[PDB]
Design a protein around this ligand. Structure first.
Ligand SMILES: Nc1ncnc2c1ncn2[C@@H]1O[C@H](COP(=O)(O)OP(=O)(O)O)[C@@H](O)[C@H]1O
Ligand SMILES: Nc1ncnc2c1ncn2[C@@H]1O[C@H](COP(=O)(O)OP(=O)(O)O)[C@@H](O)[C@H]1O
Ligand SMILES: [Mg+2]
Lengths: 390, 390
């Protein structure tokens, strides 16, 4: 009997527990598990972006919990004017609640949805919250999303910042259930390249391992690092950082002699495994710019048409980092940027500055166009050989 | 000042309006716009899977609204025991509310999240709901997710079913703002193949175009259809339908003399553009079973070629439809199936039944092994041409 009592409402965090996938991604291959840590880390990184945080510590504890400590402003502690409990508690227990729905507290931020830490709380058997703010230490404990008592002041302090420690639910995550040092490390190293002047430490209390990331060279140094165990074919890394029409676009790239294409895209420091409109603008700009270059440098009809752009990306390492008010992602996990204004921002900036670069670095230009022509001839030899077997 | 008053709670459908992307996908390239219609259609299809709907009409109106009419049970109209308004209004206005969080009302369904049609409501400047249930017609109008009056009786009727008509918000959707007949057509045609006995009509009131899909041949006929403008190389389409351990696996496939690989994956009739565990099971079983056949029958030794999976899947058309209680996906839009048990389900059924198929149809088998050898030869020739060219 299908009727009005067959309609069930999942209230609060219950929905996240029932359908974790639409919030956190894959709960079985370990990626959603680490995404839990990434949501908390992103909150700290958003405090750094805002200029308030200079120090982040990520700890893997021996009981397989993870804590994230920052010296940012501290999650607000005051009673929320509508909910009647501390804003910290609102943040932990209510989906789509946060300070990132306007641009008053964070000019630009990666959190966006207002669900990150509440999702972490929902999917944790326990969460420990310590906030240093206004000269006070506030503490609260959650067990399966439920506060054990009101947020309480337990001591004095002269510091500001937030510590969140969480113990992931045994029920929710299957297969990969233990945090992997290296996944956390890769992410925190790239965050250090993205955020000069923020100290990011990673500590593993299970085996004593630790790391301290504080790279200064920004995404140039990032491209250099990514090319470390490869062979760059040209010495001058292309780099620029611009802000136009409210959108920041930062790009660094360099070719090696390998045949792989590695383009890392970020939006407000959030990585996009599936690319999107920044990567699309990047590709369009690269293709247009290299074709213009080969035309004005008088390459043959057939050598320029030869060059596809999929040829141009062989050997390519590139980092594309955009800063956007209100980006749009096509999922909670933000794997793909779908803000269409970003495509034209990246494409325009990159067309201009990459043109310049090719003019200003003729040696790099000749080398790279050579690589591209080689890649094209390889592709063509492969095609003809394929048709020969037919 | 960053404090408790900076923390905003977005209540109900307001969250979806503020952050549509995590619910509906890409609001800029037309895909999320059309997904609006697919959410509503999928609800009707769920009534069909449960056995209560034999007739669905999708209409594109001349004012760019879309309506979906089914003859299922009708969305329940009774006052919800806890929420105190009609269940229909609960369904339209509350995220994570519905009849698919247990298996009382639908044994298998694609909706899963309890958000589909309330997301459609949220992102519609207007939505018209008409329900025919228990001898009465009930109507309600919403504007940007806000009901204009409670669900009310408007008349008498002898039919049951649900009509949802929605006018997408001009603010949410950009660039592609008009419904495309063909996108809806492709999806509905495919749904007709997947759901024998369900009449599906598509009407375009902008130009009087219409279609009536009522295919009876199931996913075999689907493969036939997908291959009709191609050149199938063997006459017997491989097909099976099984259910084991609560998991339905249905597969049809046929090779053509082309070089593209087209595998369509579905979970509870929802397509997965990004594949997932069904596709992984499929791929593994295919590769293993064809290499097994090619070794025992001696083809690998005689042609001295060492075929790979990519060789196996060149020229392949396949449909993999799984039916699972509580599938897991990695986003609201359900692009990727991440239920781990499904990989094994598909892999085992494929290994068994595909083995049997190659034995019961030796002509087909010999043709297919021939294509695979050929593809392997092209691949290796291409590899050598590329390797030399450098
Ligand atoms: N480490 C932190 N330091 C300061 N404020 C924080 C921190 N973590 C969360 N917050 C506040 O909590 C809000 C809600 O966080 P969350 O639920 O993750 O959603 P979102 O980050 O998308 O707003 C944030 O927007 C920010 O206002
Ligand atoms: N056409 C329909 N006929 C009957 N019931 C429907 C129909 N559409 C929606 N419903 C009911 O409304 C509920 C909520 O739907 P929706 O918000 O789309 O989420 P979900 O489909 O995931 O349940 C469904 O679970 C079902 O009980
Ligand atoms: Mg957050």
């Amino acid at each position: 009997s299908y009727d009005s009592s067959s309609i069930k409402v999942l209230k609060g965090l219950d929905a996240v527990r029932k359908r974790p996938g639409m919030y956190i991604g894959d709960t079985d291959d370990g990626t959603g598990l680490h995404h839990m840590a990434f949501e908390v880390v992103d909150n700290a990184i958003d405090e750094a972006l805002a200029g308030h945080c200079k120090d982040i510590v990520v700890t893997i504890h021996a009981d397989n919990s993870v804590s994230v400590t920052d010296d940012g402003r501290g999650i607000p502690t005051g009673i929320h004017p509508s909910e009647g409990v501390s804003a910290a508690e609102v943040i932990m227990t209510v989906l789509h609640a946060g300070g990132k729905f306007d641009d008053n507290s964070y000019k630009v931020s990666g959190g966006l949805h207002g669900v990150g830490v509440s999702v972490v709380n929902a999917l944790s058997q326990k969460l420990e919250l310590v906030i240093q703010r206004d000269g006070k230490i506030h503490r609260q404990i959650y067990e399966h999303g439920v506060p054990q008592a009101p947020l309480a002041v337990t001591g004095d302090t002269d510091k500001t910042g937030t510590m969140v420690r969480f113990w992931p639910s045994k029920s929710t995550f299957t297969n990969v259930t233990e945090f992997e040092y290296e996944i956390l490390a890769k992410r925190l190293r790239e965050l250090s390249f993205l955020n000069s002047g923020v100290s990011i430490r990673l500590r593993d209390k299970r085996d004593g391992k630790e790391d301290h990331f504080h790279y200064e060279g920004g995404i140039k140094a990032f491209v250099e690092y990514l090319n470390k165990n490869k062979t760059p074919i040209h010495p001058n890394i292309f780099y620029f950082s611009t802000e136009k029409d409210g959108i920041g676009v930062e790009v660094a790239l360099q070719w090696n002699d390998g045949f792989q294409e590695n383009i890392y895209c970020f939006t407000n420091n959030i990585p996009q495994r599936d690319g999107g409109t920044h990567l699309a603008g990047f590709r369009a700009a690269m293709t247009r710019t290299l074709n213009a270059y080969m035309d004005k440098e008088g390459y043959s009809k057939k050598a320029k048409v030869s060059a596809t752009g999929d040829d141009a990306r062989e050997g390519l390492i590139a980092v594309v980092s955009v800063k956007v008010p209100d980006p749009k992602f096509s999922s909670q996990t933000k794997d793909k940027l779908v803000s269409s204004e970003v495509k034209s921002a990246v494409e325009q900036q990159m067309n201009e500055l990459l043109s310049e670069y090719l003019l200003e670095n003729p040696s790099d230009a000749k080398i790279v166009v050579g690589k591209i022509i080689d890649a094209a001839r390889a592709r063509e030899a492969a095609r003809r050989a394929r048709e020969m077997t037919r």
